[PDB]
Write an enzyme that holds these catalytic residues in place. Structure first.
Site, short mmCIF file in Angstrom:
data_model
loop_
_atom_site.label_atom_id
_atom_site.label_comp_id
_atom_site.label_asym_id
_atom_site.label_seq_id
_atom_site.Cartn_x
_atom_site.Cartn_y
_atom_site.Cartn_z
N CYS A 108 -25.23 9.71 47.43
CA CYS A 108 -26.43 9.80 48.23
C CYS A 108 -26.46 11.02 49.14
CB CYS A 108 -26.63 8.54 49.06
SG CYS A 108 -28.11 8.61 50.07
N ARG A 111 -27.62 10.84 53.41
CA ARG A 111 -26.82 10.01 54.32
C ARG A 111 -26.84 10.44 55.78
NH1 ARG A 111 -21.24 9.51 51.38
NH2 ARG A 111 -22.01 11.44 50.37
N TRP A 280 -36.86 7.28 51.55
CA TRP A 280 -37.95 8.10 51.04
C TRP A 280 -37.46 9.06 49.97
CZ3 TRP A 280 -36.73 7.94 56.37
CH2 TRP A 280 -35.94 9.01 56.85
N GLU A 285 -36.65 14.05 42.56
CA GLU A 285 -36.48 12.78 41.83
C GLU A 285 -37.70 12.51 40.92
OE1 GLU A 285 -34.57 9.59 44.16
OE2 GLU A 285 -35.15 10.84 45.88
C1 HEM Z 1 -33.65 8.31 53.66
C2 HEM Z 1 -34.18 8.64 52.49
C3 HEM Z 1 -33.26 8.89 51.37
C4 HEM Z 1 -33.21 10.06 50.51
C5 HEM Z 1 -34.04 11.32 50.49
C6 HEM Z 1 -32.08 9.65 49.65
C7 HEM Z 1 -31.71 10.51 48.58
C8 HEM Z 1 -31.03 10.00 47.41
C9 HEM Z 1 -31.07 10.73 46.13
C10 HEM Z 1 -31.81 12.00 45.80
C11 HEM Z 1 -30.19 9.94 45.25
C12 HEM Z 1 -29.89 10.20 43.82
C13 HEM Z 1 -30.95 9.32 43.19
C14 HEM Z 1 -30.94 9.52 41.72
O1 HEM Z 1 -30.91 10.67 41.28
O2 HEM Z 1 -30.94 8.52 41.00
C15 HEM Z 1 -29.69 8.78 46.04
C16 HEM Z 1 -28.76 7.81 45.50
C17 HEM Z 1 -28.26 6.68 46.26
N1 HEM Z 1 -28.65 6.42 47.52
FE1 HEM Z 1 -29.82 7.53 48.86
N2 HEM Z 1 -31.49 8.44 49.81
C18 HEM Z 1 -32.17 7.99 50.89
C19 HEM Z 1 -31.96 6.68 51.47
C20 HEM Z 1 -30.97 5.70 51.04
C21 HEM Z 1 -30.82 4.38 51.64
C22 HEM Z 1 -31.64 3.81 52.76
C23 HEM Z 1 -29.68 3.78 50.92
C24 HEM Z 1 -29.11 2.42 51.15
C25 HEM Z 1 -29.12 1.96 52.39
C26 HEM Z 1 -29.24 4.74 49.90
C27 HEM Z 1 -28.09 4.59 49.01
C28 HEM Z 1 -27.96 5.31 47.78
C29 HEM Z 1 -27.14 4.73 46.71
C30 HEM Z 1 -26.32 3.46 46.73
C31 HEM Z 1 -27.35 5.70 45.63
C32 HEM Z 1 -26.78 5.72 44.23
C33 HEM Z 1 -27.62 4.72 43.46
C34 HEM Z 1 -27.21 4.71 42.03
O3 HEM Z 1 -26.03 5.04 41.72
O4 HEM Z 1 -28.11 4.38 41.23
N3 HEM Z 1 -30.10 5.90 49.92
N4 HEM Z 1 -30.24 8.77 47.37
C1 S42 Z 2 -32.99 4.52 48.54
C2 S42 Z 2 -33.40 5.68 47.66
C3 S42 Z 2 -33.85 6.88 48.22
C4 S42 Z 2 -34.21 7.92 47.36
N1 S42 Z 2 -34.65 9.12 47.83
N2 S42 Z 2 -34.14 7.75 46.02
C5 S42 Z 2 -33.72 6.60 45.44
C6 S42 Z 2 -33.72 6.50 43.90
C7 S42 Z 2 -32.55 5.74 43.30
C8 S42 Z 2 -32.63 5.62 41.78
C9 S42 Z 2 -33.83 5.51 41.06
C10 S42 Z 2 -33.83 5.41 39.65
C11 S42 Z 2 -32.63 5.42 38.94
C12 S42 Z 2 -31.44 5.53 39.68
C13 S42 Z 2 -30.11 5.55 39.02
C14 S42 Z 2 -29.91 6.80 38.15
N3 S42 Z 2 -30.57 7.95 38.73
C15 S42 Z 2 -29.92 4.25 38.24
C16 S42 Z 2 -28.49 4.14 37.78
C17 S42 Z 2 -28.23 4.16 36.42
C18 S42 Z 2 -26.91 4.07 36.00
C19 S42 Z 2 -26.64 4.09 34.52
C20 S42 Z 2 -25.87 3.97 36.95
C21 S42 Z 2 -26.17 3.97 38.32
N4 S42 Z 2 -25.19 3.87 39.27
N5 S42 Z 2 -27.48 4.05 38.70
C22 S42 Z 2 -31.43 5.62 41.08
C23 S42 Z 2 -33.35 5.53 46.27
#
Ligand code: HEM
Ligand code: S42
Ligand code: HEM
Ligand code: S42
Ligand code: H4B
Ligand code: H4B
Ligand code: ZN
Lengths: 411, 407
Positions: A108, A111, A280, A285
């Site tokens: 993330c 953070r 947000w 994305e």
């Molecule tokens: C504040 C606004 C936020 C922005 C701009 C942000 C940005 C991102 C981005 C760009 C990713 C990669 C997403 C992807 O490519 O799939 C991500 C992944 C992640 N974020 Fe953040 N985030 C934000 C808030 C949060 C919040 C509030 C949480 C949880 C409290 C969080 C936890 C995570 C986790 C656990 C992943 C990995 C999810 C996965 O592996 O699918 N994010 N975030």
């Molecule tokens: C809180 C939050 C903020 C933000 N800016 N974006 C997001 C988007 C998260 C998102 C959306 C679609 C798909 C995915 C992940 C991949 N980009 C879903 C995924 C797939 C697999 C195979 C493993 C894994 N750990 N995760 C994450 C969430």
């Protein structure tokens, strides 16, 4: 032991000691790096150690380590475990836990915001209807008419693993995908399978390119139930381009609220299998992945067609050129409608400052480079040049298998 | 132990078995991934030799043949007697080809077997090295129709007699700190350029001065040679649509030729082994021109394009980045000098992975390096899981010789 990361742009060198508190495994060994691999019921046996670690952490953070309140709480949790085989977090521990799972989320980039998280305690929830109401309130609060606020809703923890709360949707808000008889997809190809379950479960599908999916909610290990989010609660943004007037005519839009709902939150060895959280969007994305992945809306062709680029040779970089325009458009649209969004230059710059701050105050910041680097313009962002160390800290967010693969139907 | 890699764009899953032959260590542990860190005697030599000769004799379908045993015997006797051994030409060529085949950070490996090996093991002086390097440069350039090549100087003996090319690439631009406070030419080479001046070089003090070679033969002190200017092919950079682009006064060289690495074959170390291929466009346009710490031209280009540089969210950096890269590719194709774009290169590499998986049981690949520094997710490699591991023969990074040399 100390570990140094280098920034190749600035020559800044940081020292990581926090990795020493890592317990969970990485997937890597001395003989193989799995850094680009996507996916690399407890007894009281293993539970009290995990409870003790967490409460020691929690008590340290509040400057009360070793206090009578600390020892008492340890003692209380201990007995609850041996007596009931599990335990209940206090509110303050739940909030701190959820904040830290975000803080430790090495993939993330957002953070810097970790401490500003609204936690909704939905541990009194007993039914799917109850889950629907909780989720609606989260959406409304998080959306805040475009002024997005970070939030998480935490449903009851796993007990015997036969009574799990789950949100079947991978995100709270997503668009339907429909595979057509001719092989083409209508709407979002990423959601074909889930859309099909929804249809199976009784959802009448509008069958358009942007149909907001219904929620599919499992409470207490029961079969899931369908619920449509009130459309008035689903904020969406029509995508237009500042200079290209034909861009609106592509018919694109997206929702404002990225809200992940398929992950498992782990706090002090307790497992929260339904814990939707939202923040947000970073512009890429949507503009890069959602619109331009071949396996997604795949709009590169049409956009470049409309821009009259030279599409005969890839070396014209027609794809790259269309990609920038699509992303300008996403950012322009969200801004014009006053819906919170961050561009990838600003998001990465912020992350670097957050990361340096984390090294100073905390002794490290676990970070996954493969994920932190934006999927366009990688090297003109400061994170490209940043050496990162990736390791697993709890509390944490973990991936879980999709519930339709594991669920035992009651019928 | 038997590992799967998935492509998330295509759902193709490949099974890696080749990693189980993994020799060297990664930097990573069960507890910490170092995927993004840039830099993570007689006894030891015989298993190294055997392991290599085993793979060699296997490659020519002669594993367990008398010719195999006989060579394994001969090398054995040679090591016990001489404390090292010499590769047969055939073994040298196979070894060089495989070090490239095993380079996990190289996207261009589909080409691995079309490699011209120049055996410079008879070289004894820095002048000899210069002669060998000029011929390499000329052969590889080939009037713009570039051909892959490696030149292999004598192997490490006792370590006090190393051959080294002091330059990191055969062809690079000088960097000079200015009284003005800024940097003239390429800031990546400032320290090397000082050492050149201090060893005698007379610098033109211009923005695109080809550096002199600094050649160290037989552990002696390095010497200065200028590559004949007529051998250093260069390309003026113009845009197919922006007429003003030429006025930036940008050029780049055609020949990417890494000269600072260490070639390890069957336990032997070739410390001077310059090798070259041809450029992927983004290497110049994205990294050389746009890195803050490099020529850093984004602002000047953006200004000429009259983009809104008021806020990061207009994506002016991104917009100008694309143009800079259209211009590099356009110029090289126009001057008929081999160049590949990142779409084409990464597509080739996916096809190469596929071949390597069925033909060899895998392909060590470092995703951090393989994914281009622009438009990552629209190239197929972004979506391709990769396993990174170290196989031998290999190219290894080695410390800049000036930090090691006894003058
Ligand atoms: C504040 C606004 C936020 C922005 C701009 C942000 C940005 C991102 C981005 C760009 C990713 C990669 C997403 C992807 O490519 O799939 C991500 C992944 C992640 N974020 Fe953040 N985030 C934000 C808030 C949060 C919040 C509030 C949480 C949880 C409290 C969080 C936890 C995570 C986790 C656990 C992943 C990995 C999810 C996965 O592996 O699918 N994010 N975030
Ligand atoms: C809180 C939050 C903020 C933000 N800016 N974006 C997001 C988007 C998260 C998102 C959306 C679609 C798909 C995915 C992940 C991949 N980009 C879903 C995924 C797939 C697999 C195979 C493993 C894994 N750990 N995760 C994450 C969430
Ligand atoms: C055919 C033309 C070639 C192309 C398009 C190509 C492509 C690349 C690219 C894009 C990189 C990353 C370099 C960077 O970003 O600094 C790379 C690195 C590398 N390549 Fe290839 N390559 C080619 C020829 C070769 C040849 C002929 C060899 C060996 C004989 C080779 C071995 C390597 C090694 C060892 C690295 C990593 C260097 C380092 O770690 O600094 N390349 N190549
Ligand atoms: C044969 C060849 C073909 C091609 N298309 N490009 C190249 C570029 C190789 C190159 C050029 C400049 C800089 C670098 C490398 C960085 N990109 C130099 C380097 C630095 C450090 C710290 C570690 C490490 N392993 N390597 C590689 C070589
Ligand atoms: C195979 C590879 O790990 C996979 O494509 C990853 C790469 N980096 C990513 N980075 C982000 N932010 N999100 C992703 O989904 C991915 N996908
Ligand atoms: C810190 C990080 O490892 C470093 O910036 C890397 C990232 N990926 C790279 N990829 C390539 N091809 N070349 C590089 O020089 C780098 N630099
Ligand atoms: Zn690793």
């Amino acid at each position: 032991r100390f570990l140094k990361v280098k920034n190749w742009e600035t020559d800044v060198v940081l020292t990581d000691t926090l990795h020493l508190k890592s317990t969970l495994e990485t997937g890597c060994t001395e003989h193989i790096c799995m850094g680009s691999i996507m996916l690399p019921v407890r007894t009281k046996d293993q539970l009290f150690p995990l409870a003790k670690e967490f409460l020691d952490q929690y008590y340290s953070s509040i400057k009360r380590f070793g206090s009578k309140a600390h020892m008492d709480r340890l003692e209380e949790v201990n007995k609850e475990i041996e007596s009931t085989s599990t335990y209940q977090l206090k509110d303050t521990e739940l909030i701190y836990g959820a904040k830290h799972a975000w803080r430790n989320a090495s993939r993330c980039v957002g953070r810097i915001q970790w401490s500003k998280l609204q936690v909704f305690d939905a541990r009194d929830c007993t039914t799917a209807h109850g889950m629907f109401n909780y989720i609606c309130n989260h959406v409304k609060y998080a959306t805040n008419k475009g002024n997005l606020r970070s939030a998480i809703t935490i449903f009851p923890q796993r007990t015997d693993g036969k009574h799990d709360f789950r949100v079947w949707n991978s995100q709270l808000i997503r668009y339907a995908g429909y595979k057509q008889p001719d092989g083409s997809t209508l709407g979002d190809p990423a959601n074909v399978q889930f859309t099909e379950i929804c249809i199976q479960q009784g959802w009448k599908a509008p069958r358009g390119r942007f149909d907001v999916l219904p929620l599919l909610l499992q409470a207490n290990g029961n079969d899931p139930e369908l619920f449509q989010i009130p459309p008035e609660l689903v904020l969406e943004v029509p995508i237009r381009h500042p200079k290209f007037d034909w861009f609106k005519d592509l018919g694109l839009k997206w929702y404002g609220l990225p809200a992940v709902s398929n992950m498992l939150l782990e706090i002090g060895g307790l497992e929260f299998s339904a814990c939707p959280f939202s923040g947000w969007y970073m512009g890429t994305e949507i503009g890069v992945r959602d619109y331009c992945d071949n396996s997604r809306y795949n709009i590169l062709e049409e956009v470049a067609k409309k821009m009259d680029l030279d599409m005969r040779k890839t070396s014209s970089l027609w794809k790259d050129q269309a990609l920038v325009e699509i992303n300008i458009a996403v950012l322009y649209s969200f801004q014009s409608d006053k819906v919170t969004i961050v561009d990838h230059h600003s998001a990465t710059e912020s992350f670097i400052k957050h990361m340096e701050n984390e090294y100073r105050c905390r002794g490290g910041c676990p970070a996954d480079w493969v994920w932190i680097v934006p999927p366009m313009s990688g090297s003109i962002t400061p994170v490209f040049h940043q050496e990162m160390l990736n390791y697993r800290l709890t509390p944490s967010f973990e991936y879980q298998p999709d519930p339709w693969n594991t669920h035992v139907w009651k019928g």
